[model samples]
Target: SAVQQKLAALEKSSGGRLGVALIDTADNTQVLYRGDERFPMCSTSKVMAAAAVLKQSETQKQLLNQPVEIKPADLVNYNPIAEKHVNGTMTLAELSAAALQYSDNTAMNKLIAQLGGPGGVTAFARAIGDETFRLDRTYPTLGTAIPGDPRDTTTPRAMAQTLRQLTLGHALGETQRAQLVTWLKGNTTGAASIRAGLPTSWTVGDKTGSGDYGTTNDIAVIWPQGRAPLVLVTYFTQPQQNAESRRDVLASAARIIAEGL
Candidate 1:
């Protein structure tokens, strides 16, 4: 396929690892390029955390509106948006917005705590029939040269499936689903990755992840004109010798994926 060949060229050009999965919603058609291997999800795991919280909110109806105190423990990674809220209080809804829209680490840690820790987040993914995707550790944790350290991890296929479910109304109720999409669309981060590769006419709702030892990823639902939406998941590990080179590869990968669509 043209997409696969293009991805191969990208991988060769960067001299890095890459995993990709693109699924067409109209006919359920799919494609993959190194799609099975798992990689550290980094901040992208925040989306999974958000799903768990949203599910809980739908169940208890109180969880969404519940307010929690933001203590020092909630501050792990420095976030320009969430830093001001330290020692302040915010509802789960507000926290979620900050977390998703700006990739606020403090808000994410607070949400994980609210869901009862990393195990709770994993349970939600399992419940959704995703066996391999796991959230084993908190954010800002160090990544290893070694592979698969039980830190938050996922394969391209799993992330793509998760996003598909979110859009298909199986992940959340109508109201929560809308909220999730809004948050993703409003995501201000990752402008240089997949989002940059897209044309202004096309819209992408995406979450990005970056980690130590060269990991770059983006999972997105792309809306193209006059056609059904498509899910494009890209994960790159064992990246280029240079960080900027890896990102360049990612940008090119996104462009190729969009063109193939």
Candidate 2:
């Protein structure tokens, strides 16, 4: 079958290891090349972060627009990203968008701090009734190496489950989830991943994550015909690698899958 051949070829073509699990969001129909194994979620952690923030807001409409002070002292010894936007003032909302859409580590650090620190994010996530995952404890300082923390942890199934809740009005409140979806709609990167094959006019809510260690991931919601929408989770990693190679492998694999399906 074409699907079988495609799956076989994908595993062979990837320069490193790959794990993929896709489902029709409507009915849970699935196709897995290599799924169920645990892999780092990378910046996809932002999805849970967004959910935590919204959960905080729902409890007591926090002032997302309130101006926040960013200290230069806060910019030392962290991800290269946090250093880029050091010592600038931005609202909670701006930081949230940057963390989710731009995958800005600095912005995320501040937002997590404002939301009552990393523990708060995890607490909020637990409040939503999911216990398997968590927020990175050493946040404010990005962790890049293998064996990462909660920030780098999420299963394909967990990611899909969270998105499912968002779609079902169970995650963040309806209004907040809609706003999160809007912010996700503006995601400018990872287009070449699962979304590359989507109808040019279709609206896809997705995010991508990359780090120095050749880690990459993409999760998207694709609305197909009369059937249900599709949720795609693609994860790739090179135990010994660099950025360019990661991009090449992830992009090519993603293109093949998105377009092939």
Candidate 3:
């Protein structure tokens, strides 16, 4: 409870609410702060989108082997990786990397389309026993954050649990599972946030997201030298649309989880 008060004070100082969930996969032990509240997912949904795509291929098997050329109209903002291949092609795995590693909008849109849309990704989350995730739109549109909007939102607990299935559970095929872990670990956006909170002895593979209202998120599976990995989710947002997105809020949250757990 001291950590909860600390977290509340942390959020108060930032003019935002911080949603946190830290699970010890070894025993399902947990420490949560506003873990059940909904927060706009922003690009974090791409993890589910990518996970769905990977799981789908488990049965289909031919899914990741093909070359893909995204429709010209699918492109949107912040598509650094996707823009390079607009007139060319990228393998499905490559796009998965782009989406997870860069949070590329075009890559996310392409992956969402491959699954038939946001609904498919939502269904995938439920199929894996997650009840809090819902995807109602594709990127650019979905990236617009509203504090209480039901669309494109998920709880820190739900996302951490769902991500466990991909990162630490048997939900994904061996090949696709390792692939996703690699992609998540290679993400370029999380270093200063959740990852910064832990000591160097701990290693983490993570995903990050951003949206309006200063909505910023980082979810990760962390490894300490000699213990079971920890699945952690941190969501930060505020009432004001222009609230500052502070990386230290989640970093401090991570540090708290590290010390408390």
Candidate 4:
């Protein structure tokens, strides 16, 4: 409720749609800004793609060590200036890690391809219980444009539930779940929503989504030793001229809430 009070004061200071879902990653207790509002996932879809790979591994449909080459066509040909990371035959494990840690669209597209191709991403989403979230291929970027699934949407609560499942080992086998968590811990890139609130020593596995004018989001699982870790998903939509300032608004709010936990 402290957030609500802050919102009352900051509504004028920050103009945008802010939706959040905060849950105890350890116990599942929670809170939100507009947890039920459905919003598009930018690169955050990597989390879903990552989970699909783990599912396939469990079914022996895919192998973590199996090497797959990222064709030049699959490269970020859309952005001529985008940094071109080394192109080679990388395993699914490496792709998943890069996809999560760096929010790499090229890596995400490649991983999405491995998860059964673009069509496979939709199938995987349904099989994993995100029946309402749509995955479209029209957008050249992974999480940037909703050029395909015009109605594509996801709720903060849904994201919280998804993270909880990952933490609870409901997404894959114990071994696979452990591996996924390890990768999450290894995530190097994402927004500051969760990290803003976490201690330097504690680890937070998270993914962020951001679009041109009106988007900023983060979903993560936070661990705090003796206490249960927390699950958090926060979104902000606005026409802020200064993007980093908008992000800090969300991060600062998250940090405050996280400190409370």
Q: Pick the candidate with the highest TM-score.
A: 3
TM-score per prediction, in order, is 0.93, 0.83, 0.96, 0.84
Off by over 4 Å in 1: 142-150, 239-245
What lDDT does each candidate get?
Answer: 0.79, 0.66, 0.87, 0.68
Q: How are the candidates ranked when ordered by lDDT, highest leading?
A: 3, 1, 4, 2
Candidate number with the higher TM-score (1 or 4): 1
Error of 1 at 218 (Å): 0.9
CA lDDT of 6 in candidate 3?
76
Question: Which regions of candidate 4 deviate over 4 angstroms?
Answer: 7-12, 25-27, 77-87, 143-151, 240-245
lDDT of 4 by residue, 8-115 (tens): 454456676677778875555777667787776766667888888888898785698888776667666232212344455777887787777776677777777776
Candidate number achieving the greatest lDDT relative to the actual structure: 3
User: What TM-score, to 2 decimals, does candidate 1 have?
Assistant: 0.93
Q: Residue 149 of candidate 2: its Cα lDDT?
A: 38
| Residue 34 shift from truth in candidate 2, angstroms | 3.3
Lowest lDDT 10-residue stretch of candidate 1: 142-151
Clash count, candidate 3: 0
Candidate 2 least-lDDT 10 residues: 76-85
Question: What lDDT does model 3 reach?
Answer: 0.87
lDDT of candidate 1 at residue 47, scale 0 to 100: 85
Model 2 compared with the native: what TM-score?
A: 0.83
Give one digit per residue, the lDDT tens place, for model 2 in 69-91: 77786653333444555566777
Ranking by TM-score: 3, 1, 4, 2
